[model samples]
Target: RPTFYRQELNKTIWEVPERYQNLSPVGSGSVCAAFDTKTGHRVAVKKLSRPFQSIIHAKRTYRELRLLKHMKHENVIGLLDVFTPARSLEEFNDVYLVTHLMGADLNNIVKCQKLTDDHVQFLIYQILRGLKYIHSADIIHRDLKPSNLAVNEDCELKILDFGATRWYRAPEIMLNWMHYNQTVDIWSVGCIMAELLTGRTLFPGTDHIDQLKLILRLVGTPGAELLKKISSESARNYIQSLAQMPKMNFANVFIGANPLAVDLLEKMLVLDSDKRITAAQALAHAYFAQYHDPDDEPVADPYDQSFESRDLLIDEWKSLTYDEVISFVPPP
Candidate 1:
């Protein structure tokens, strides 16, 4: 059996000796540490800060663990472990979750350069696959944005961050609150697709109001009946007001994107949650089928391809531990 060590433990901080280096942060919102362990492997440790409105925030981490435990798709980030220090002298205890540290996320990639049509199509297809699996398993990733999508050295995209994700309860549940369900994820998918095509956030809003404004501007506003379904009175009022606002057509926003790409985006951005395309249906859309290589092809498995040659790497890092594998960067 492979030997493992637990170097240090505390209520808030845990040390792994010289095994992993504390590298720069790669995520958004909060600070995170990157580490390349003794075996020359890299992983990220996300430490949650305090003042959590509810203990449920910490519980979400455990929910992520349970959800990820059964998920084995290549386009979804894998959770390695969840840790709560045994003891601590600090006033507020921090919760830490460990996950494979892939390359920069799509948000960072867009910052450097615009994505090509081919890249967008490829990424969207992979994302749909991951989302489809999650939905099939009755999970809904409420927060599906470009920043949560990680790209490895080979440029394969993986969906990350399930803190806001939840199991699909029912449409009535959604009607009662901004509840977790397939539509929430579908909405996020549309947002990500739009960002990929435009190289900027589709709804670059400062708050929920701004976000709703942006959404209305891009996809047209929802009507009174549509607004009534929303549980929050404030949210309903906002939508009702938004419905009276001028409509904006996003048809030409993606100038260079293929027509099919725009079609996919349109279906995803529909205001009526029920009208939005589900992940399974999106996979069957013409856009994905058009670009997908046949299963029997030599390069059929996109994730297996070698990064250097852009060919399949074919399980080269299969034996490596999750922590070790994520930190390993291929030569440029």
Candidate 2:
């Protein structure tokens, strides 16, 4: 039986007294606390503060919970129990979701060590599997960044944080629009994949405008016909402003990257969202087919080693300030 605490008539809170205050904070976006009790078990409690910004946001969160409840994959994070405030204290209420604590996010892991070709391939395959599962349920994880992907102690990948996700949201949203769908998630996956290969972000820009510039530079500018369908006038104007940016060949940027890896990256980072490969299609790609295995051995413990040496890199990446990383020009 689960214990429940009523904060208000409509909302309720559940207490995991088992999870003592072994609160360790990790990562950005929302407050997260890691608890380890005397029972020698570890769990993470994430609090979603305040109501969602929009109806779409709330719907996505609920959709993620609903989909996760039925999802039975080892690579996807399992939702244990949800804590909602009682209806009476709605405004003061807090919603907390609990789940098993994993080792570390991919962002953290990458900073610690360089990934081998096998490691990168394995990570991409696991992510595709997870994405395929989500897409099957008609849910799109719009925010699929490296930090949202975790490498557990077993070295298995798990996708996390679906607050920005949506259902069938692609066609309605365009390149510059705030509205989004699964293709955005695929784009994010491509960016993360590129980062994994080069140890840097592909669209390493500061804001939405800059990100648009970076996208145009690599994927080429979208034409007027394509711009009409976009939801926002401001966004269409922004896209128009980038007509003079030099076109970049994404393949050339990854000259040092493995051939197959570069191919996968190119497909995901396509300019037109509709043209971007779906997660299901990506699963069938030759790159994934080549490295996937059913009998592969699991990693014993991914975070058993100390992370002190990579702390500096982790800090720089999290801050999105890569001046230090850029200063070290690779040998010509």
Candidate 3:
């Protein structure tokens, strides 16, 4: 996105990069986001306010950066560049991240209008493809929801929001299922499918505890073996104390949906993580059977670990400052 110089300055102008003016904020939450970056190459600039605000925030920022920097996937967000205007440590509270900008997030699109079945199928396929890439690299998205899912008018999709978008969090996350892995991510996708079919979250819990309560009602209680995996004593007892619910009725849940698609959804909505379906396997399911690509190369498991996502110790994470800008900018 090519930036233009405008002499006009007003209260609306933001403290953005030099030679670059904030067109307007595209989106903002924990961090403020703005339109395009770096001399006409359209990209998103996300400002990290006191990213070192806490241990959790710092770790999340580092993890997302490292992961995005190393990732090269069409359906996943990329790290275009990072910088700051601050010349001294004392002036460096804000950190700016530059990346490809999106037209709208999946949440807004799905909420604002109804999607055709073809749209649903393609969206689900793209989500699975994205997940397959991450899971292959041994990274668990941990957080998956529509808001974190970015979409364009052309129907392209990308997953975002690593800092815990919990509305679509898997049941395992809420009930202290520490052993949760890639399958947990698939569970979140199932929730997304439910929302796409009907403009409502599968289990829109009010809070953490209430989330698990809703999950219990929707998925029904897991079997004794899956329940045994619950590590939290209080959580386990609370789950066990809950009454049994009706059997999973996927077609009924997402009424008028394709039977084969419902079959895939039921497989993913499985309560037991061990039985949960995987993305790679889902791609080959009968639901997508008609859309199979004969010439497509097989996506091998154990995707080469070009980058290992290691947690930066809180000390090292907090030690970052504006000086990092020089390292980010390449020499002429």
Candidate 4:
């Protein structure tokens, strides 16, 4: 349970631990954060802007909570704690969550660092490792961009933000094809990998059409062999009508890059989701030749969702928010 305090005059005094003071704002947008003087920890607090007030808010809040709670991975964010000032569920209208404070996100690292081959490899290795865990669990981290990845000065990184995840939505996802899964994340991984190496987004487009064009310009237009995978004739026709593009070929584009690494990227960014390399296979590829934990045995992914609550409506989301906040339990 979290401590509470009464309002005095125009000020509200908190009833947290005696040493917990000097609270200063941290991250921007959506969350309220501060540095806690109590335990040398910077804590960030997140509360939905409005629940029943907006359906989008309600949807994202519940979905994020479901993923963060059930997910237990080193490379993923965890819910440190949550509480409601209202005390009881029936009277509850607020939900406050506490999470780990990271120094900065991977975006800063890419813009700031003059990365070496070693630095790039280790970072991508960690990314692939985290992706392997996520894909195995059957969760697609839909939006995976530099800002979505958290980083510490210690050179460690963790993936964050599930709200915009569907942006990494595969072609099949946009097409509403039934079998879409983690393969799209592979394409995003290629984008990220290229950014780490070249210090720029592989396809930094301004809009949907521009984004598609940038992709074609960078990787060349998809060949007819792979174009057969499109779900709709309209999509296929639009793609064919785009400027005829020639393959840049990874070796030519990524000069001095490890041929193995470039090869891995090519496989991941393939036009067809079926052709994209799976996370498990990507981990074993020669690109990540440095680690050797298990040559043959596969990782066990036990946190698979038994049933998802994300499909719930506004009323249910508010109910879930109250329950989740009131049932706060810190991990031991």
Candidate number with greatest TM-score = 4
lDDT of each: 0.59, 0.59, 0.69, 0.68
Query: lDDT tens string, model 4, 1-332?
Result: 44564322213233333233444444332464455564578876665545456766776666666666765666777777666567565666555566778878887899978677777777777777777777776788767777888878867778777243333335455445677668888888888888788887677666655666666676677788778677678778877788899877888888888888799988987767887998888878887787524443234356645435346677777787666555656665
Error of 2 at 304 (Å): 40
Candidate 3 whole-model C-alpha lDDT, 0 to 1: 0.69
- Model 1 scores a TM of 0.67
lDDT accuracy of residue 311 in candidate 2: 31
Model 4 reaches what TM-score against the true structure?
0.84
Candidate 2 per-residue lDDT over residues 271-306, each given as its tens digit? 667778987778778787775553541321222112
The better candidate by lDDT, 1 or 3, is 3
> Can you write out model 1's per-residue Cα lDDT over 1-332, one digit (the tens) per residue?
12223432232334333444654554442434556554456787665554233444434433443455555667777656444442322322444556677768777887887778878888888888778766766666666777678887666888876341211112233335654458778777777777778776666666544555555576666666676676676866644554566545556777777888888887877777777898777877888866554341121122221222322222221111122323433222
For model 1, state the Cα shift of residue 272 in Å. Answer: 0.3
Q: Candidate 1: misplaced stretches above 4 Å?
A: 1-12, 17-40, 46-58, 81-97, 162-176, 223-239, 293-332
Better of 3 and 4 by TM-score: 4
TM per prediction: 0.67, 0.67, 0.79, 0.84
Against the true structure, candidate 4 has what lDDT? 0.68
- Model 4 residue 300 CA deviation in Å: 7.5
Off by over 4 Å in 2: 1-14, 17-40, 47-67, 83-95, 162-181, 223-238, 293-332
lDDT, residue 261, candidate 1: 84
lDDT of 2 at 212: 56
